[PDB]
Design a protein around this ligand. Structure first.
Ligand SMILES: Nc1ncnc2c1ncn2[C@@H]1O[C@H](COP(=O)(O)OP(=O)(O)OP(O)(O)=S)[C@@H](O)[C@H]1O
Ligand SMILES: Nc1ncnc2c1ncn2[C@@H]1O[C@H](COP(=O)(O)OP(=O)(O)OP(O)(O)=S)[C@@H](O)[C@H]1O
Ligand SMILES: [Mg+2]
Ligand SMILES: [Mg+2]
Lengths: 322, 314, 254, 255
């Protein structure tokens, strides 16, 4: 009944994929027993939370409900919270506890500089009775002191083999068939976030479950994800580089209207396509990149859509003149 | 185990390396004893807290435990504290040598609420005969103007290269570590003035790979490799730079902010190209960084940054 | 199916008042040996345990072990309505979901029936391991309570130390320091005011102020309290009772 | 330095609790004659003086005069600990940074020594000269406390009148008004119910209600409170003690 994102959440260290380089390290740390303060950081949908919860459940077993405290971002997070709750949990020694407790701060990069200073002082004070674990998406918004105090662990995105294995395990445990190009388009659009994959899978499941036997074609995947198909990108680029102004404008308009295309993703795909052309001159590439970056920056502030579309067309056309 | 930064923390004022003017000022202060209220401002990890701690220790001698009140971000500093506890501590009778005084050391003064900083005014103005205050702050702008004006301001510049090198060489000699000059230069590079971070990176490298070498440091820092970023920023044909940025940096999950910061840091140290071209490349990288921080982080922005850098270098 | 009648009413009153503040929800388990209860505070520092046999009661009958998880605040609210000359009686039947209390004195027809719901928690966790304590002592409850709530204003960390026949309670804070020193002595005329001390090794450890203040509130049970101190082990504060005891297990500090 | 041994520990406890609500910081000038203290209210309207001679100390030895300036909240927190049947002892070292208070039980070895950190106060010691007060009276302390607690429930000012051997208290608030009069008399059966009066000039003064409510707390020290009123000078309230006195100097209001 619960969504796959919550259902297929791993419960052991073995059920994590594409992170062996960190799994062997955490297994060494748990067999040695010298587990220090940890920092897990990386792009979303990678397995930091799942890995740390599995590690806590493995180290503490049933005592997990007592010696493990999870805190999230901005839970009335003044300095008062770090003064009362975390400080009491760290300082207070349980009745029948041997070892140390664990306080896991999820998405803990949203702390102010004063809050991070309080946290670094706290972790410095009681570093002998408990160990902390800080999770982050961007490791550049944390004070270098807190970073230096613990050991870092970057979570590289999931490779193709890991996501393919996981979608295979999900497929065999569910009533769905998956076409060969479907998984290719899936891996190309997801960019390596397992959460988005597990979301879009159940989405297209509920979407095209009419006879319980329909095949998930690339059309339904591109619809549910809301991403264009590379053929349309090639066609619009061809129309821009070949036809005149009015026809290319009408083609761009109809392609972005009938399918619901944003100029941002369209420009991303267009520059991805242009990245592999055999351009004879160099000034064309420079002008193209500069003008397209300017268009994207201007779109980031929400100007007049038709004007930015005409500007995209003009930049692409005036760049290819040598 | 034990952190080197905690084990080799200077306890005597003379052992502090860095600013040569303010450390001699504090030396003469401890020699005389008539210390005024003082705010100590500066960038993180350059020796602010250790300085005031060593000053208090050397100034009070055997009475440090009874004549010093320290308040960091962990302790509660609201309205009730500054009104009751600090005031009852300032009035506390204590017979010290003729020149000494009780010391109140407030660390991370920036986190102290303005309304809380209000109460300290008369408490420190009235009892100045047997009590002196030392604030330690990163940015001296969050301190209210009255407290800003009542006390002497002491600025701490960021650490230079020779001072950090001397301290690291002292630590190595005391620890009998195998090293090389390029490894020490890599430590200086990844530190940029943070003595604490420099020592911690040194200890992490020694614990992880044993020998202090460039590849070891650059594998333990988890930052983009400076050599490959320099090659990206110095390639002749633009397509080589674009291919480098695409395959060697963008695929491995590096954050765009880290790429821009590493490009900034390496362009600062490119002592082979001219000075004006360095300044203009820094300008371009900074405009790209400002674009990145505003919410857009597309690969196209970094591509345009590289394109403009090449256009400048041509 | 469960019938448990007392001799007085103030007995259960002070029994509940003893640990009414430390925890809110508590499970009473009844078997042929009597009634057993064990709980822990939210901070997981103080472990309260209460055992009452089948002798302080007058009529006690039950077929199988039964568990009743109830709130202590509401139980005290109900229990505070009785006179000191009455007789309380716990009544329970098949499928226990509502406990019945009955106040009744034979001198006048006052049948006071009170039904109380049961909020179950299903968390027992009773585990008592150590039986060898390094040092033990026994002293009047009033003296210990006076000392602890006298030294509680100075600081929040009370230092207990058992030296060579010199029991010493120390406290140090911001307004000063306090030191209570008591030596053992036996009074032949009044053993109820004697100080018993058996020491195998000199002991020195610390405890929190608020935890001791919550412990000593169970001083109305007995006039004599027994302290058992031991390194690498929690300290034990025991209050005897005609048919059992109430014991607080406290975890020291660093 | 100084060693003072009280006979009953409740004495100093009552002394401190008598005026611990009108002054936050008091200075105790320990001389060879005894203990003398004076402290001004935080609003500079109510002065408190206290004299305790050597007769109130079982053993009192002072090496040289000293000034122990201690708080009253902390001293009341400490004095609240000891029982009644104890032997309080005050001890101080040379250059006193802290005072030591020993509590010893006569029939036990339960010795409890406490330490108190002395404060630093500027000795703004004013000298008091005896003035010939116009009206001098004395009355049972319970009577005065009752009268003040009854009249203060109406306004924030109480008017005292001494005219033709008659005492009068008057209050006029917004919720109403009230008046009481007292006639001097004496009874050989119980002299603790006599209202003395010696008038030289009929006087009319007005005092604050809160300050009188704080002063009347001294009714636990003695039973016969004395009052000295002048035409314009601050009123003097005196509670006598087995070896000394506690005096409240109160400043009148304006017309
Ligand atoms: N490495 C992985 N192997 C298998 N399933 C994974 C993996 N990473 C994520 N998942 C799945 O995706 C879900 C989300 O994982 P999370 O741990 O919540 O991601 P995250 O690392 O916390 O990133 P955030 O929370 O967005 S910053 C999990 O419950 C799993 O179902
Ligand atoms: N000049 C120096 N000489 C030697 N060690 C230093 C020096 N400056 C900093 N350190 C080291 O840096 C560590 C960090 O402590 P501090 O420098 O006091 O931190 P900080 O300067 O207060 O910066 P904060 O706390 O983030 S505002 C110290 O324990 C020292 O080991
Ligand atoms: Mg997460
Ligand atoms: Mg600091």
């Amino acid at each position: 009944n619960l969504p796959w994102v919550e259902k297929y959440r791993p419960e052991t260290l073995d059920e994590v994929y594409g992170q062996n380089e960190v799994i062997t390290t955490v297994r060494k740390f748990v067999d040695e027993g010298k587990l220090p303060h940890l920092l897990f950081y990386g792009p979303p949908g990678t397995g930091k939370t799942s890995t740390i919860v599995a590690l806590a459940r493995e180290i503490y077993g049933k005592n997990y409900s007592n010696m493990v405290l999870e805190l999230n971002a901005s839970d009335d997070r003044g300095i008062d919270v770090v003064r009362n709750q975390i400080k009491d949990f760290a300082s207070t020694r349980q009745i029948f506890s041997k070892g140390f407790k664990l306080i896991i701060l999820d998405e803990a990069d949203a702390m102010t500089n004063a809050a991070q200073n309080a946290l670094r002082r706290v972790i410095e004070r009681y570093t002998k009775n408990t160990r902390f674990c800080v999770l982050a998406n961007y490791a550049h918004k944390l004070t270098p002191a807190l970073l230096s105090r613990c050991t870092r662990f970057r979570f590289q995105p999931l490779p193709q083999e890991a996501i393919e294995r996981r979608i295979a395990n999900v497929l065999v445990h569910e009533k769905l068939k998956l076409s060969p190009n479907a998984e290719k388009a899936l891996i190309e659009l997801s960019n390596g976030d397992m959460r988005r994959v597990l979301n879009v899978l159940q989405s297209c499941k509920a979407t095209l479950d009419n006879p319980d036997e329909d095949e998930i074609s690339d059309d339904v995947i591109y619809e549910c994800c809301g991403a264009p198909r590379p053929s349309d990108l090639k066609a619009v680029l061809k129309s821009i580089l070949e036809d005149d102004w009015g026809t290319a404008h009408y083609t761009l308009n109809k392609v972005r209207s009938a399918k619901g295309l944003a100029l941002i993703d369209l420009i991303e795909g267009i520059v991805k396509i242009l990245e592999d052309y055999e351009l004879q001159n160099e000034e064309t590439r420079v002008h193209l990149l500069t003008k397209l970056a300017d268009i994207e920056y201007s779109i980031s502030k929400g100007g007049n859509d038709q004007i930015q579309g005409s500007a995209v067309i003009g930049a692409i056309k005036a760049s290819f003149e040598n | 185990q034990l952190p080197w930064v905690e084990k080799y923390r200077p306890q005597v004022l003379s052992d502090i390396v860095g600013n040569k003017e303010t450390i001699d000022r504090l030396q003469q202060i401890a020699k005389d004893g008539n210390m005024p209220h003082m705010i100590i401002s500066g960038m993180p990890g350059i020796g602010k807290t250790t300085s005031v701690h060593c000053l208090a220790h050397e100034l009070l001698g055997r009475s440090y435990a009874d004549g010093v009140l320290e308040l960091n971000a962990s302790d509660d500093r609201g309205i009730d504290v500054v009104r009751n506890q600090i005031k009852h501590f300032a009035q506390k009778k204590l017979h010290l040598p003729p020149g000494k005084h009780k010391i109140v050391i407030l660390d991370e003064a920036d986190s102290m609420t303005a309304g809380a900083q209000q109460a300290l005014r008369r408490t420190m103005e009235l009892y100045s005969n047997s009590t002196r205050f030392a604030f330690a702050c990163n940015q001296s702008n969050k301190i209210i103007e009255p407290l800003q004006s009542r006390c002497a301001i002491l600025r701490y510049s960021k650490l230079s290269d020779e001072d950090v090198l001397k301290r690291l060489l002292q630590i190595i000699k005391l620890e009998d570590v195998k090293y090389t000059n390029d490894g020490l230069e890599a430590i200086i590079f990844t530190a940029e003035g943070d003595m604490r971070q420099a020592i911690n990176n040194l200890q992490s490298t020694v614990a992880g790979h044993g020998l202090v070498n460039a590849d070891n440091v650059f594998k333990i820092v988890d930052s983009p490799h400076p050599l490959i970023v320099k090659k990206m920023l110095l390639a002749s044909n633009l397509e080589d730079s674009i291919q480098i940025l695409r395959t060697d940096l963008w695929k491995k999950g590096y954050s765009s902010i880290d790429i821009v910061t590493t490009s900034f840091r390496v362009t600062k140290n490119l002592a082979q190209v001219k000075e004006s071209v360095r300044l203009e490349m820094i300008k371009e990288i900074g405009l790209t960084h400002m674009r990145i921080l505003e919410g857009v982080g597309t690969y196209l922005q970094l591509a345009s940054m590289l394109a403009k850098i090449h256009k400048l270098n041509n | 199916m469960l019938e448990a009648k007392f001799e007085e009413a103030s007995l259960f009153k002070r029994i509940i008042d003893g640990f009414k503040d430390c925890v809110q929800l508590v499970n009473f388990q009844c078997k042929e040996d009597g009634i057993i209860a064990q709980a822990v505070d939210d901070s997981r520092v103080l472990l309260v345990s209460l055992e009452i046999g089948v002798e302080a009661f007058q009529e006690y009958r039950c077929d199988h072990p039964v568990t009743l998880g109830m709130d202590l605040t509401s139980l005290s609210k109900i229990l505070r309505c009785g006179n000191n000359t009455d007789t309380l009686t716990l009544i329970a039947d098949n499928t226990p979901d509502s406990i019945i209390l009955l106040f009744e004195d034979t001198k006048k027809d006052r049948i006071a029936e009170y039904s109380l719901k049961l909020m179950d928690i299903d968390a027992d966790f009773l585990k008592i391991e150590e039986l060898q304590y390094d040092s033990t002592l026994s002293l009047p409850s009033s003296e210990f309570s006076k000392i602890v709530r006298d030294l509680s204003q100075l600081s929040d960390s009370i230092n207990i130390m058992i030296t060579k026949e010199t029991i010493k309670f120390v406290a140090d804070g911001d307004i000063g320091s306090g030191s209570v020193i008591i030596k053992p002595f036996v009074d032949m005329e009044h053993p109820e005011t004697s100080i018993k001390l058996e020491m195998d090794q000199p002991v020195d450890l610390t405890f929190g102020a608020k935890y001791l203040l919550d412990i000593i509130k169970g001083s109305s049970l007995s006039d004599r309290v027994g302290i058992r101190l031991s390194s690498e082990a929690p300290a034990l504060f025991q209050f005897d009772l005609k048919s059992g005891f109430l014991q607080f297990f406290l975890a020291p500090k660093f």
